[PDB]
Amino acid sequence: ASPFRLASAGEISEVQGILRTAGLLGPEKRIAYLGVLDPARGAGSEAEDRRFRVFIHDVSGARPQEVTVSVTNGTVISAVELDTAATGELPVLEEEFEVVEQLLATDERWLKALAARNLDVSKVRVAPLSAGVFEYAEERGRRILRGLAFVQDFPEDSAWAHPVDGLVAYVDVVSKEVTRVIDTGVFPVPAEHGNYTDPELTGPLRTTQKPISITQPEGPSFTVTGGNHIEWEKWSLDVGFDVREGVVLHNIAFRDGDRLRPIINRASIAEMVVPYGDPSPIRSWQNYFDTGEYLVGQYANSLELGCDCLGDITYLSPVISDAFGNPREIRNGICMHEEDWGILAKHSDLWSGINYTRRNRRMVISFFTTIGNYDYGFYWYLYLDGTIEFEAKATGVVFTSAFPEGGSDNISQLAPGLGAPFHQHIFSARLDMAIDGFTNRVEEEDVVRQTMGPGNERGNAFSRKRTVLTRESEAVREADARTGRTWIISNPESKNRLNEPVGYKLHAHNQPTLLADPGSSIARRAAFATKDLWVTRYADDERYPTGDFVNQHSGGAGLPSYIAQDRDIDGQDIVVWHTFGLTHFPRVEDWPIMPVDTVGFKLRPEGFFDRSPVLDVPAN
Amino acid sequence: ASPFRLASAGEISEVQGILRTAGLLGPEKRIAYLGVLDPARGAGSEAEDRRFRVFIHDVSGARPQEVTVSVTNGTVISAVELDTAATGELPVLEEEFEVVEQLLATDERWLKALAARNLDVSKVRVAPLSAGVFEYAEERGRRILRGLAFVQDFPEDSAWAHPVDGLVAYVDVVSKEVTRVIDTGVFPVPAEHGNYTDPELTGPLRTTQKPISITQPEGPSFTVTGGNHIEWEKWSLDVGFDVREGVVLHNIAFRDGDRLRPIINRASIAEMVVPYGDPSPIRSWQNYFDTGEYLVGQYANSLELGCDCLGDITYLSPVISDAFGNPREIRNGICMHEEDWGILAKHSDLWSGINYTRRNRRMVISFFTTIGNYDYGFYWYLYLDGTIEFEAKATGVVFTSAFPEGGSDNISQLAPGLGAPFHQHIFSARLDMAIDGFTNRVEEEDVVRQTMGPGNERGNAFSRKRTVLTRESEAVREADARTGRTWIISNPESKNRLNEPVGYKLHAHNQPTLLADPGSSIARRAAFATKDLWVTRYADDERYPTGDFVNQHSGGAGLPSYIAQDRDIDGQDIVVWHTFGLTHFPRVEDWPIMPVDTVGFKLRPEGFFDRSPVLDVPAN
Ligand SMILES: OCCc1ccccc1
Ligand SMILES: OCCc1ccccc1
Ligand SMILES: [Cu+2]
Ligand SMILES: [Cu+2]
Ligand code: NA
Ligand code: NA
Ligand code: NA
Ligand code: NA
8 A cells, every 4th residue: 555665567567558658669769767756745635646757768869758657547647858968868778888889899990999909809898988078069969978998808707907098989879970089099908817706816715714604583573564664673664666776765764652753754875976086088087977877776686695695684676667668677686684783782880780781783774786897785774772874885896997107196006007097986865854754954063172261271171063054055064074073953843851852963974075176077067976965955856966867967957956946944844965985096905806895874863762762672 | 832822810820929029019009900011022032021010009108119020030020119299190999999989978078068968878879080180289199089979779770860960079098088078069969760671761671673693503713722812814813901901902914825914013992081071160170091090901891692792702711910919810801703794895797797796704802891880892803805993882871960950061961950961982092013014104195186277177187195204203193084084004115016015004983082172181191182193113111192100190191202202103113093082972862871882993905915815705
């Protein structure tokens, strides 16, 4: 019955049929994005209407369409022809990944460049890289991909070990025209292989690792009902899946006594971007938005037991659309399980003689995705004590280049002649807040140091200050680690027993934000990435910090546009957008496959409860 | 045979006998600190000499002594009478914890103050709080404790729920004189109990938690030999225990092919301090150094299976001295085990078709200690990929006060009339570095942003810079989270295959450092806490950032004195001192017993290896 249930195969087939019948899904059409739309606000009316949003691409060169359909009524709600030079190109298709290599393989400029380097064209792989927006006039309104080459010596060879530097090409994937081929000069192609399964490279595998067994003889402490509704240790939520954002959490709430108390209405990673910091023309254009341009959900991995998720696991197998509207299941694409988390609370008291120890645990909801060379794990955690946390785990193979003779200020060396250009991985968490309901506000909290003097004669005092963010214009905030800056989301109309408004405190990692010059294309296209925290007023159509159509969009889209409305956010339905990321100067240890590195954020209750919420946890 | 073996009961008995025979341990003497001394530098001579350092207190008012003895030769190496007004008082004795309450119970001023508040003296507990150094002339050279009162309604009652504000007393624990009683006025004593085991407060315990079983059917992957030598997944180290610092790690090294490569010679938490930020005279003097003043090792908990350490556990049971020189075992005081740590490395490659997943694990060495109201877990982690990490877990019961009518800028409210003064918990990690040997240097690494212009026409470039710290005078460093500041410890004489010096990168959490005004007593006594990173030249007698005798020391001791020597640290035997801590504005959820909060740091290899060190990890 739940309006937050996962999309079904049947629903996806209905969308296909509705689209087909309406004349919108002929043979030259491709579905570039398809997702179910969340229930609308003020929906306490009881009138379920399952709607899906679709981006439809045309391979024959006709303009694409944005379409919303109702799978309840079988109707097309809206169908709008898009002007891509205006509002952006559609997300990259998986079926386009091979096109760049294929178009270049018969191009004389490209073959010439390969020939100079003595590379058999049959062995040259070409990365299908998003183009962004730079100085090339002919690219406006064209569906462009850029291509960088990597040699693959044999079918099972890791191409990333063999970048072809000094060469890049641009292709119109629709007209099938190679628009430009740029050769700045030959660089040696790194010769060492990067094959991390080769005994030559790995050496003899370890025999020292003894097994670790994690089991639950009574089964899990959480229940799953209605397909995706989770209940666990007072927590309640719905686990959604969208082909763009991946795992999405809905209706995060905590059972406090008799009350079901909302905390976050919707939590997602609404964008991620990987900007490169190498000023070489071969790569200075490169900034892929894995979420917005490539859609990380469609590449979610099937997670295998004992390997990806250890212990007592419950899987969801979300259904997506293929490029033709057929339902495709990602089997075991989402892991759900609880983990022991060490000590929760502990005290041995010298006066009462009481010794007390309780253990902690967390509910984990996760998926792993792959987009070319890079692979990410996305993890949401719910803790017994009311803490909510997200963690991204970055791994895969680093994007490579030549390492210049004489070195580089913007590239690191991984192996002889093999380079790794500097880059960032920057995420945006979109948190549709609902602290005890929708009437919320955000305060910026700073530590306040105090001067020695009257009222502080020993110079020991320190304090804190809170600044309420009242309007969107003043809600674009930056980190200040030195002054312990956090942000509190509170409900001014809902007070705890000490008569203070209930709250949750956001703790950032205070990692560097976007490093690019503010006049850069990427600073404009990824403006969200330039500040740590944004607060907006909720709106149905404000979904992504980068706007709906990120691919080849000229800039200013998303958050910087939304906040221009300068709406009231002081005791209103608001959305917090947190930017957090990793700045990556690759190390030799990252090669030839990268050990996981992590980044994320958490929120902890701040006077949300009237006392510790874990006093009723048993002794074990 | 190892010179790094744990102290034995027999060794401690030898120290007692040697001290007794030398006339240094008569009936009025107490051992305030006893610990074994690490092997000296340049010790490739093969001549074991187990030495112990002892601080000896006298309860009759005679001056204390610092004594070093050899348990090999049975000799007193040195015995020096201390002038405590000059160099500081000795650490607080456990047997002194009860003295403050006992002395005050027959004092007329104290009884008067209690009587005004209608508190039965039999029910009033008094915290034995370190005194620090302020304006009280009579305190120089006196062994003083300050006392704050808490009512305990019955034997098993949590006194912390019932602070007696507006009252503090000072006592000379040797002369048994109450020097001052200060009553600034009556505050209501908070009436609600804080008994977290009471069904009235906890409510019905949860029945929803299903068991989680962690077992190793083949046993652990690490070996323990020689009592405390650990070998695990290429790691090698010795686990020490000192009554002051607690668990200490020695000779951390990594087996890389045929080579045993040193990384850290000695790792410890060499000090921790908890400064309070309430300008009330009742508490404005309060800054306890749990390590330096109280000795956290002597209060290490006996850790029980299934409760404190879950899984396949191997315990050490370290031996310490009691106040009379008798050996006392802390049974199961140290936990050692390996934990699964999720995904280590993962890639599904679109061109090779190879799907690859490896799991991570970490070796954990930990202990838990209790000092009055507060309890801490100290955890060291070694990861498969070469990462070293420390984590402190803070729990117990928060130090309480009245909550002022009309509120407070320096105290938070936990319950009706119950306050929690603002404070910090600040740690100093002392890392005696040995990156591939003792010839080390430290660089400060900052991200460098670049301006759009010639050579960076698209404004996308960013870089990094490194600054070698050459002399101690310039090695006092502060965090800069905004510019991604880290510190690299390298060996300029040991290069990897790409001909770069091998290194390890320190990643700080960039939490606020000491907040007190720089003119404060605590800023002088805890100068280390005012900066994130110090580098010194190794010296035998430079052990603690606060000096040897922290209790009632007037200031300037430790690091600020050491760095005055302005020694060469560029390619030399050096020691890194990292300050990291939590700034605590207590929340209602922290009451009546605090959920664990954490803080720490890590180091990751930075071109230490010639490629990823975990390519030989099996597939599971
Ligand atoms: O991450 C998306 C960019 C990318 C896509 C395919 C191959 C390499 C890189
Ligand atoms: O943490 C050391 C200070 C302290 C000691 C004993 C009781 C309360 C506080
Ligand atoms: Cu990276
Ligand atoms: Cu605290
Ligand atoms: Na445009
Ligand atoms: Na909201
Ligand atoms: Na002095
Ligand atoms: Na050293």
